[PDB]
């Protein structure tokens, strides 16, 4: 199965990178979505979100041969500098890894149902 | 062997040692960088060892990389690009290049990363041979 995580813990670039690596993957694209410049919370129902993430991964891998996609999304409280999402896509060639990573994040942004809360301490 | 531009310098590293995603990632991170894209170009197999060298003097290659970075950064506001490049003897699976690009938003980060690798491949001349 693909690497597909929804967690309250800091995301791992190492893990996403490893999930997507392999002898035949010449190109790897990794997207990191960081929190920019006050408290921030992500609230989600994990079963629904994870299912949605799996759907997205399947559609992205479907575009070209040898394409591997991994996704990690964070929930809970976040700080400036924290990764909210980490996406990895690999392919024999760089074009297909760029295509899959970009497709993955656009779909995620459009589809993953999430509540965003902002208040001030 | 390692040469790296640190501080205010744009991140540029030439080495014969294993590359690091984390270092490149840190190099383009910032309070206002909301979207970050990393490209890793790996040695893959076509039926086990690859030797890679510059066709030019390393300082010439650095000038080239620094110029490429400048141009990629000039395309939009808040764009940061970083390049790590490895030569010598590499294994199947080894990273030959790690590129990082960041920006306030994701679109410019993807643009910068893609532009960077494209300019690199057409402007940085590399001696490449496969061995057994
Ligand atoms: Ca050549």
Curated annotation (Swiss-Prot), chain A:
Domain of life: Bacteria
Enzyme nomenclature, EC number: 2.8.1.12
Pathway(s): Cofactor biosynthesis; molybdopterin biosynthesis
GO biological process: Mo-molybdopterin cofactor biosynthetic process
GO MF, one example: molybdopterin synthase activity
InterPro entries linked to this entry: MoaE_sf (IPR036563), Mopterin_biosynth_MoaE (IPR003448)
Annotated binding of substrate, by residue: 34-36, 93-94, 109, 116-118
Catalyzed chemical reaction(s): 2 [molybdopterin-synthase sulfur-carrier protein]-C-terminal-Gly-aminoethanethioate + cyclic pyranopterin phosphate + H2O = molybdopterin + 2 [molybdopterin-synthase sulfur-carrier protein]-C-terminal Gly-Gly + 2 H(+)
Function: Converts molybdopterin precursor Z into molybdopterin. This requires the incorporation of two sulfur atoms into precursor Z to generate a dithiolene group. The sulfur is provided by MoaD.
Family that this chain belongs to: Belongs to the MoaE family.
Protein name in the entry: Molybdopterin synthase catalytic subunit 1
Origin species: Mycobacterium tuberculosis (strain CDC 1551 / Oshkosh)
Curated annotation (Swiss-Prot), chain B:
This enzyme's EC code(s): 2.8.1.12
GO biological processes: Mo-molybdopterin cofactor biosynthetic process
Catalytic activity from the UniProt record: 2 [molybdopterin-synthase sulfur-carrier protein]-C-terminal-Gly-aminoethanethioate + cyclic pyranopterin phosphate + H2O = molybdopterin + 2 [molybdopterin-synthase sulfur-carrier protein]-C-terminal Gly-Gly + 2 H(+)
Disulfide bonds: none
Binding sites annotated in the UniProt record for substrate: 42-44, 105-106, 121, 128-130
Transmembrane segments: none
Keywords linked to the UniProt accession: Molybdenum cofactor biosynthesis, Transferase
Pathway recorded for this protein: Cofactor biosynthesis; molybdopterin biosynthesis
Pfam families: MoaE (PF02391)
Single GO term (MF): molybdopterin synthase activity
InterPro entries reported for this sequence: MoaE_sf, Mopterin_biosynth_MoaE
Family classification: Belongs to the MoaE family.
Complex formation: Heterotetramer of 2 MoaD subunits and 2 MoaE subunits. Also stable as homodimer. The enzyme changes between these two forms during catalysis.
Function noted in UniProt: Converts molybdopterin precursor Z into molybdopterin. This requires the incorporation of two sulfur atoms into precursor Z to generate a dithiolene group. The sulfur is provided by MoaD.
Name of the featured protein: Molybdopterin synthase catalytic subunit 1
Organism of derivation: Mycobacterium tuberculosis (strain CDC 1551 / Oshkosh)
Lineage, highest ranks first: Bacteria, Bacillati, Actinomycetota, Actinomycetes, Mycobacteriales
